[PDB]
Each structure stands twice: as C-alpha cells, then as structure tokens.
Design an enzyme around this catalytic site. Structure first.
Site, PDB file in Angstrom:
ATOM      1  N   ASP A 183      -3.914  50.417  36.366  1.00 22.81           N
ATOM      2  CA  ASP A 183      -5.040  50.003  35.569  1.00 22.81           C
ATOM      3  C   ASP A 183      -4.463  49.103  34.481  1.00 22.81           C
ATOM      4  OD1 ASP A 183      -7.688  49.972  34.291  1.00 22.81           O
ATOM      5  OD2 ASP A 183      -6.813  51.392  32.837  1.00 22.81           O
ATOM      6  N   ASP A 185      -6.283  48.265  31.155  1.00 29.49           N
ATOM      7  CA  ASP A 185      -6.667  48.632  29.800  1.00 29.49           C
ATOM      8  C   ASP A 185      -6.336  50.074  29.432  1.00 29.49           C
ATOM      9  OD1 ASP A 185      -8.297  46.309  28.490  1.00 29.49           O
ATOM     10  OD2 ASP A 185      -8.799  46.329  30.638  1.00 29.49           O
TER      11      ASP A 185
HETATM   12 MG   LIG Z   1      -8.771  52.513  32.391  1.00 35.48          MG
END
Ligand SMILES: [Mg+2]
Ligand SMILES: [Mg+2]
Lengths: 396, 396
Positions: A183, A185
């Site tokens: 991922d 963020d």
């Molecule tokens: Mg995330």
C-alpha cells in the site's frame, strides 16, 4: 555397515576439536551418518552419528581412543550404540518471529508458555536483529491442528506483552516468497497524500476526518473517496507536483526495497491514491507495477472527481492478482503489506498478508502484524537478518 | 538499561526449560538483547544476553534465582556480566557442502584440516541428506583472500577422499538463485541422443568414438557435430520419435525439477542435440526455455546436416544469457548444470556453474562438482535438504 554409534562432544569451544575428533575416528572403520555442530556463547556441542562394524563399535578400542582424545584437552564426550536413533532431523513445521522494543523477558516467557501449552517444541532460537528492533526467531514443531490454536494464543500474547509475534509455515514452498506489493499511504509513504492535497485546498480538517474513518471501517471506500477528492475541486493540477516532492518514505523503506531487489522480488504498489503523485516515486524506487486511482483534470484544474474504475477494497485484491499473473508468481508465493481496512481483501488474497502499523480492522485478519515505525522489519518476517542486510549493503 | 548480562544454560534437554528461565528473568528488571538455542542429540544449549539495570545485574538476587531454578531440575547455568560481548553474531561468509557415498571420517577429517589450516572457523554443521547420498553442510567464516586458497585445498580433498566438496558464498544475494539451465545429454537425460540415433543407422560405434572425444575436448564441437550428424544421412525422420520415447531421465531428474518449481525457478535446457527430440520432453517437464540445434529433414529423410546456427560451446553461454534476460534474472543469480567441455562457456558464465558426473575438462573450471548418478543432489547445493523435499512432496 553394522550397528550405529553416537558420539556427542560438549564443553567450552576450542580450536581443532572437530578435526581432532574425525582424525581419531578415521583410525577405526568409520563412515559418517550425520553430523551436527554449533557454538553458542563459546559452548560447543558436536553430535556425530557414525556407522561402523559390530567389530569396531562393541570394541573398547574406539571408545578409549575418542574418550582419551576429547578429555585430554578440555571437553566431555559420551558414546552410545543406538540402532534406534533418528539419522537426520525432520524439518521444523513453523517459524515464529518476535519483534519488540523492548522484548521483556516476561514477553518472551509468555510466548514459550503458549508454545509449550499447545504441545509445540522449540527446535532452534536465534536472533535476527538488534536494531532498530530486537528480533528473535523460534523454529518450532507444531502438532497438526494446533496451528489455529497457536496463532490465537500468541496473538493474545502480542497485545498483552507489547511485542510483534508472527507464525509462518516453515515449508520449502511457502518460504520462497517472490512477489510483494505495498500500500502507499501510511505504508510505503509517511502519511496520507489526500490530506496533503486537501491541505492545499484549505480542507485538511474535513478530509482527515473522513480519511481516518474509511481506513478504519466506518465509511465505504468509494463514497468516501468521492466525497474526499471532491474537496479538491478548483485546485490547479500543479498541486500534484508540489505534494509529490513533499512526501517522505517510511523509515527503512529504501532498505526494504533494496533488500527485496537483492533477493530478486517483483515489487509493486496497489493504492487508492493517485497515479500522478505515485508514479513519480515508483520510477525512483524501480517498481515493477503500479495500480492507483486517477484524478480527473479539466484545463489544468482538478474537478474533484476521479476517472474510473475505482481501486476499492476489492480492487486491491484484483490488482495483486493481475500483478501476480503478469509476473508468473502463484498467489501463495505473494506478499502484501498495508495499513487500512482498505487493505483487507488484498492481504487476505496474498500468500502472506502483513498489516503495518495498522488499524484494528486489518490487524484482525492479517497473517502478521508489525507495530514499529520501521518498514524494514518487513524483511525479518521474510527470513532475512540484520547482519545479512548489513553484509550485503557493504559490498555495494 | 545499564550493563549487559549473559546467561548460559547447558545440559540434557528437558521440557519447560526455556519457559522456566524466562519466567524467572521476568521477576527481575530484564529486557532481552539476544537469544540462541538448539538441541543436538538431547543436549540443550540456551544462550541469553539480557539488558538489566546495574541494580539488578550486580545484585545477588538475579544470580541466585536463575542458579536455583536451573540447578533445581538438572541443568547447569553460568552467569557473567560482560559489557564487552557481541550482541548478534555476524553471518557466515561461505557454506561448504560435503556429499559422499560414503563419507568416511577420514574424508570429513581432511575437510576440517584444510578449513582450520586456512584460518576458517566452522559456525555450524548440519546434515542435509541421508539418501541417496550423505549430505553435510558446514557454514564457515573465511578470512578475506583465503577464499581462492580454500577452494584449492578442498578440491584436492575431494579427489583424494572420494567425496564431493563445494564452497559457495553465504550472502543474501548469491543465495537467492532463481534460474537454472540443464544440459540435456548425460545431464538431464541418460546417455547421448546422437548415439541412440546413430544406432538406428548402424553407426553407434563410429559416433560414440567421436562423441566421447568432443565432450572431453579433443575435437571442435562444430566439426564434430557435422561429422557426427552426417552419419544419420538416409534415416527416415520417424527415427526421432522412436529415440525420443526411448529416453530415460537421469535418476532424480523429476524430483529435481519439481522441487525447483516449488522454489519458483525458471527452468530450461541448453543443448547441442536436437529440438525435435528435446521439445517433446520439455513439454512433459514444463520447461520455460529450450535451445537446441536442428536436424535438416528433406522429404521425411534426414540429410545428415543441421540447420544453423549451431549451438556450439559459445552458443550455450549465449543461450543462457538470452534466457536470463527474457526472464529478468541477473547472471549471478543463474545456475547451469552440464557434463562436457561442451558446457565450459555456459558454466563459467552462470552465477553458479555445476559439473554433473563430468569430464575432467569441465570439473576443472566448474564452481562445483557432483559425482554421484543422482541429479537431485543438485538441490543440496541449492540449500535444500532431503527432509524438506520429503515434507513438500507429501502435501502433494
Ligand atoms: Mg492504506
Ligand atoms: Mg553435455
């Protein structure tokens, strides 16, 4: 090749022992069935299973030669005919990683209790790091069916004692992991791009509200993202460059990726953020694959909507699978590292699903949970040690 | 976190020791710096480095608690403040594999002598197989510059004592090997296809002469192959099917490839034999890549020549490189296994070049030499153990 004979040497380590013992054994009629040796804190244990004739074995010659040669210079030696003893140990069934800062004795104790309670023996323990986090590996043998129980047991230990505890299969197959996706963020990247964008608008508050709510579970990701991106309507799309070079890689992220490259991994990211901001960074880090949503720009101005399809929670899984296929890596040999409920379908789908400093929603369905602000601790759950990383790095 | 304190427990293994020791340590103010443990032939060594305050460490409380608890139930325990002791051991520099049938004590002795002579210590020894061949791993620490010397030393030992001895780097990088290519004739496959073809002609004698001469060195491969294939002129090209399904895979070849698949390897063959015969088999074994020469057929009849370009000795290297590129594997992370001087440029070029039951010409420039008629022993030089293979196979 008559009876088997077991020689076991212990004592304070000294040069030439291994060689002294085998030089001696060569004078008698000996062929090696198995040899095990290690020195832990200057303690030698040398374990030899030999296959000599009934003549040599039941003869006081061999015994007095080995006994004289070991004792003559410090150490102890036992010698017993077996013909009932295993030749070569079966592999560990699983491996357990304990990461803490610190790892209290109390923490380590709780782990061993649960292990012993559930009928599991510890075959080996070693360290796999000292900094940034203390890392300890236990390779264990787990009774069939205890597997579900043991993770349960250790997961309570994790939360109570304040250490990360992971259980992985110690098989040939599920050890050769070769594809990992992060991922972006609050995983690969410090913070949330969409709050950094909403800040340009003057809307950091409205957004960081909904944001820390959707990656926790309360809000559907699609309707969250549309209401979140909407807040950016009017902004000049040059904002994307500004925030892109405002980003800080998670602590250890470069080390993580570099080591993963050394080990020949396919690396990629699967995000619900924005290709325009991400691709700039993915070129830098030599990524093999990017999947992201996309901001709709009209005459150099964001319109506050996105260009479908939306990478939603189901999207992330689908993107991992697509990435797995193009690279020719079975799903069980794949890894996903994410932090939000956003990442649930992806982590479930992956061979090994790792929650990184993650909301309770993810940390309750992930194969493994890390809880330190160091992304390189992903490497320890993949069989790497600090000393190895440190060695490899130093040859450039 | 004042001074460091080292607890070392030894003695005959018993349940609950690890847990008993850490439960005890939790009553004092202890954080774990490092833990090492193993049981060899029912001998326990448990090595703990803790980080407690000057209060707890120089206090007789801790000492008498640990000493009482260990001794109360069988084992021995030492306890010494250090503040000068290493936390976490540096990795081994190299690893050495010893394969024999049998491995005499004399053989093993010769290995340890050379090791000790050249300033190398043995960090670990374990078994990696019992059948078909006894396999023993020594992970060692080699002084810089001793590396060239140590291989030299062990290669003499190999020939004298009748064991296979291989030295490999024990680094992160050069351990994640991921692409392997086999020679076909007298490597992956029992015997020589071109003698099996020449036999159909009635020319097994003329050919097996020149054949066992070119893969030994006396004859240039191109001019050898043209003179060899020539002998087939007149044969109906249905001979190719006949000899194809007359072939016997080398002992263990299926196990070798299956395990390599489990570990996620790209597998292929690079031959100076004939695509028509080979591709049939490469479909069966799910190969990723084939490179071979090609027999010129005219009206269903061989003409005794081949269709260029000729996979010659330089060709094999070039084919490995092409295969490495299409699969995206650096050359140093590649493996080649071959038997003839045919295979010299290929094995040299590869990350790890393995000679299999090979002519002296190859066995003198190859990284590693095997000498048993079992191709699965290739796996042991790639870090796999029998028990692992045996485990993985049993889950289907
Ligand atoms: Mg995330
Ligand atoms: Mg050959």
């Amino acid at each position: 090749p008559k009876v088997s004979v077991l020689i076991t040497v212990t004592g304070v380590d000294q040069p030439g022992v291994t060689a002294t013992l085998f030089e001696v054994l060569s004078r008698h009629g000996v062929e090696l069935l198995n040899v095990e040796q290690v020195v832990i804190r200057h303690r030698l244990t040398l374990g030899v299973l030999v296959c000599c004739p009934a003549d040599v074995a039941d003869g006081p010659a061999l015994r007095h030669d080995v006994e004289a040669a070991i004792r003559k210079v410090g150490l102890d030696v036992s010698i017993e005919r077996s013909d009932d003893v295993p030749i070569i140990r079966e592999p560990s069934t699983h491996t357990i990683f304990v990461l803490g800062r610190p790892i209290t004795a109390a923490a380590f104790g709780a782990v061993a209790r649960e292990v012993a309670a559930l009928g599991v023996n510890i075959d080996l323990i070693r360290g796999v790091s000292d900094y940034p986090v203390i890392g300890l590996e236990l390779r264990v043998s787990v009774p069939p069916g205890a597997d579900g129980a043991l993770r349960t047991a250790l997961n309570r230990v994790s939360s109570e004692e304040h250490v990360d505890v992971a259980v992985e299969d110690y098989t040939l197959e599920r050890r050769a992991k070769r594809l990992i996706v992060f991922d972006v963020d609050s995983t690969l990247v410090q913070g949330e791009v969409i709050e950094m964008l909403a800040a340009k608008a003057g809307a950091e508050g409205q957004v960081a509200a909904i944001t820390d709510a959707a990656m926790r579970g309360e809000l559907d990701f699609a309707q969250s993202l549309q209401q979140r991106v909407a807040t950016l309507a009017g902004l000049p799309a040059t904002v994307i460059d500004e925030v892109a070079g405002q980003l800080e890689l998670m602590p250890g992220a470069r080390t993580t990726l570099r080591t993963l490259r050394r080990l020949g991994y396919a690396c990629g990211v699967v995000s619900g953020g924005f290709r325009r901001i991400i691709e700039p960074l993915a070129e830098e880090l030599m990524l093999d694959y990017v999947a992201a949503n996309e901001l709709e720009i009209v005459d150099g101005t964001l319109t506050g909507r996105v260009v479908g399809p939306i990478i939603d929670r189901a999207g992330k899984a689908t993107a991992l699978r697509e990435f797995a296929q193009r690279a020719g890596v079975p799903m069980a040999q794949t890894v996903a590292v994410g932090d939000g409920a956003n990442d649930i379908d992806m982590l479930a789908a992956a061979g090994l699903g790792i929650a990184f400093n993650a909301k309770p929603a993810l940390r309750e369905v992930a194969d493994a949970s890390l809880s330190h602000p160091y992304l390189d601790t992903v490497l320890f759950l993949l069989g790497v040690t600090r000393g190895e990383i440190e060695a490899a790095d130093a040859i450039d």
